[PDB]
Design a protein around this ligand. Structure first.
Ligand SMILES: [K+]
Ligand SMILES: [K+]
Lengths: 383, 383
């Protein structure tokens, strides 16, 4: 990124080092990129990338027989550099992903197969997800939205560094209704104590998904406050994570929530599907059910939707009838100031202070007129 | 075992083979024993045998410091053939087995440590056992003896080849009170179906202790009927296992039941200890609580104790007052015949038909007199 084309004569790069790390710095300047691996490499005859690859072609209906499988193996990048394929096919058979009809040896997708493909889910993750859902449908808590959120809470990657001492403090202060959900999932208070007392991550044993469970329940709490319209600064102080890690999490959970919804629909689990089908939109914007209609407008996010709701505008229909200058004023009240704000400067009438995507700078007035204009266009398309 | 010392001139050994397996047979005749491994060998820096070895010397109080540890490492068979030790010490620290007091670096046993040593349990198994007990004390079924038996049901080795189709048939016919115990443990009906329908053992994943759970619950059912004085032939037909596999199981479970009882006592878990402390004796002989007093006599097993109980002799005290020839007759009624038995042969008055340990052949009369004689000696020692 050193050197602007058409602007600079040269691009300069400086790597600051010490005498001790002097040799490692030179290694980088002379270093070159490593050769590209296939990521489908084989004491592991089976592998995730291959299992998914084989599942996609069989369920999709472009690979039926055993001859089609090895023909596919020829097209891979792994074979370009110049058994394992057969192992993945059996794996799909053992775990009810694929069917075999002896037309000798022809493979067809199951309901679980077609569901996994439509859900864009990884076959390795689908097994635990399928069990987790069946476990939840045997005993489910409906008095709050926490248990539902847990099912759509992603835990395939760490989104933040969790302070366990902070976690235990929230555990005790946690209401009884949410402790019931914790117990029902696997959250044991004993494991939480062995985390604060001693910084033993363990996780060496495969059976230590016990760690992931507590990380997942911690995350669901964050997502619970998030769709409860709890301020980002409160969530930051309460949990110990920045706004960057949160936004990356909600956009991840919004997508994941859609996956579990599709997965539940293709298996015929209507009751479970019915509950989940409202959280994709709520996780995206971080809102409650009431603001779901307002946030259809492009410029209206969580903060702008709430202040317009609390001012009499509950729906797009109510927002189309709106007086523009009234919308503008309500927007002006949602701004965050360090001092308890909420002189006359008439030189700020042209200040473009509202950002969009692929944006021209919008004034607070122009944005308001756009919100009312868009609301009317949507109101007509609703008929 | 070919050649009797002082009897035979030679010992002959014949290995019958085919032309195809001819070469493998010669390999055995010329073959010799492999060198003895240390079984404490090290991508495994930690190992079970070492962890147990280190735990025993610290808890026992013969190894306190870090110098004592490597001094011990010198005495091992592994070092005789001529790092890992330090890894095991940390493991004992991470899992609350051992304490460290910075007298720089001195290691002491915890309550969990001293309990494991007194229980003769393996440190690797103790972790899951400790969790299983804590899980059981949160929700425990007392209406039957099944849930208690599960806690003392050993599953570290396979004692028989379980027919899963047979298992599912017993599952449906299983009463509601015992289905509640199954659910409470982990027995899912879905996994039972995927065993009968398809012979997929899986168990490749470490998290597949789900297999062990169903094997363990199957075993507890056998142990339940066993202490319910259900005939060995019925248990054989019902489950599909021989009397040899059963006897090896009960003597294994009798010992294991004693271990869990001691383990519970050293942790202060009195309520749990109280329930378990009656099953070591019942698992040994395969009896109900009523026969616990009778089986104190050496010659009285499960079968002989029951027929004497059903005939008026409930205790050793009642058995000391007994008329010998009456005891003899009751014993004669407990014999199993193929025909519906239960001529006059007075030539069988000297037939030694009762076996003992380190035995002279006992007549049904001599045995009866021994039972009454022993009962009197015990009755006096009871005072
Ligand atoms: K929007
Ligand atoms: K006895």
């Amino acid at each position: 990124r050193a050197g602007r084309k058409g602007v600079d004569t040269v691009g300069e790069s400086i790597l600051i080092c010490k005498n001790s790390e002097k040799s490692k710095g030179i290694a980088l300047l002379q270093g070159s990129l490593k050769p590209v691996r296939s990521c489908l490499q084989r004491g592991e005859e089976v592998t995730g990338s291959m299992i998914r690859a084989i599942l996609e072609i069989i369920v999709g209906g472009v690979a039926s027989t055993s001859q089609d499988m090895h023909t596919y193996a020829a097209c891979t990048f792994l074979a370009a550099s110049m058994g394992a394929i057969e192992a993945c096919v059996m794996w799909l058979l053992e775990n009810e992903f694929i069917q075999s009809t002896e037309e000798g040896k022809v493979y067809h997708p199951t309901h679980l197969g077609s569901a996994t493909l439509s859900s864009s889910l990884s076959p390795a993750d689908t097994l635990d997800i399928f069990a987790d859902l069946q476990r939840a449908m045997k005993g489910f808590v409906l008095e709050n939205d926490l248990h539902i959120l847990y099912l759509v809470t992603p835990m395939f990657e760490d989104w933040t560094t969790i302070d366990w001492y902070r976690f235990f403090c929230l555990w005790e202060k946690l209401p009884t209704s949410m402790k019931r959900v914790a117990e029902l999932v696997g959250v044991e208070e004993g494991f939480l104590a062995r985390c604060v007392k001693g910084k033993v991550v363990a996780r060496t044993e495969r059976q230590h998904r016990q760690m992931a469970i507590h990380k997942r329940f911690f995350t669901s709490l964050v997502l619970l406050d998030l769709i409860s319209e709890v301020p980002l600064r409160e969530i930051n102080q309460k949990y110990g994570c920045n706004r960057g890690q949160i936004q990356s999490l909600q956009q991840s959970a919004a997508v994941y929530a859609g996956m579990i919804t599709v997965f539940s629909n293709r298996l015929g689990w209507h009751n479970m599907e019915l509950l989940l089908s409202q959280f994709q939109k709520r996780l995206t914007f971080g809102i409650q059910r009431e603001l779901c209609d307002l946030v259809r407008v492009s410029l209206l996010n969580a903060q702008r939707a709430r202040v317009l709701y609390a001012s009499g505008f509950h729906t797009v229909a109510d927002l189309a009838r709106a007086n523009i200058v009234e919308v503008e004023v309500i927007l002006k009240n949602a701004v965050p100031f360090k001092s308890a704000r909420k002189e006359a400067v008439e030189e700020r009438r042209n200040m473009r202070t509202i950002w969009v995507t692929g944006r021209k700078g919008l004034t607070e007035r122009e944005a308001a007129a756009l919100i009312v204009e868009e609301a009317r266009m949507i109101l007509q398309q609703d008929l």
